[PDB]
Amino acid sequence: LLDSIASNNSAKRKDLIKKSLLQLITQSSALEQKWLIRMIIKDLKLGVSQQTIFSVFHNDAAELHNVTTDLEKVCRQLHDPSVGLSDISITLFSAFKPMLAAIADIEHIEKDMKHQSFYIETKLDGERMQMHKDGDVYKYFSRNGYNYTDQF
DNA sequence: AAACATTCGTTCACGTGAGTTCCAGTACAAGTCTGGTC
Secondary structure, three states: OHHHHHHHHHOOOOHHHHHHHHHHHHOOOHHHHHHHHHHHHOOOOOOOOHHHHHHHHOOOOHHHHHHHOOHHHHHHHOOOOOOOOOOOOOOOOOOOOOOOOOOOOOOOHHHHOOOOOOOOOOOOOOOOOEEEEEOOEEEEEOOOOOEOOOOO
16 A cells, blocks of 8 residues: 555655545554554654664664665675675665764874874865766665665 | 778770672773765
């Protein structure tokens, strides 16, 4: 039902969205409808961190989610708790969580660089993107893993 | 020969250092909140 509603919103159709929501309402209880509303809004407020959920799911799941950024692969590969992954590293056509930068104090900057020469670069204002190229197959991914390939 | 002073092992009290348990405070991760823009 959620897939139908999302695709149908993407297709510029509202009568079908109304039908799907009506079916969900008619075939749900008050608590189920409340939870469904929370998932639609994309907030649950469970009080438990996503990192905790991933850790309980498998020993090495946060790293795999960072490298891949797709709940399907993490859920599929990490099924048997005993069986782990030998080596996890960036792979083609799979979004990876970008590496960010933290505030720095000009006074102790040299100390933060272990008293060694460093690189100074200009700050760029705009979107953060990553490009995957294999032959003439191109994929573009945004900061959080959304696919912007259609635009570019 | 008898009385008084000094000394020594003993006793009590008090003070100081080291080990154990319980609790206040701090740095940072993550959740949550919010503003502006097209």
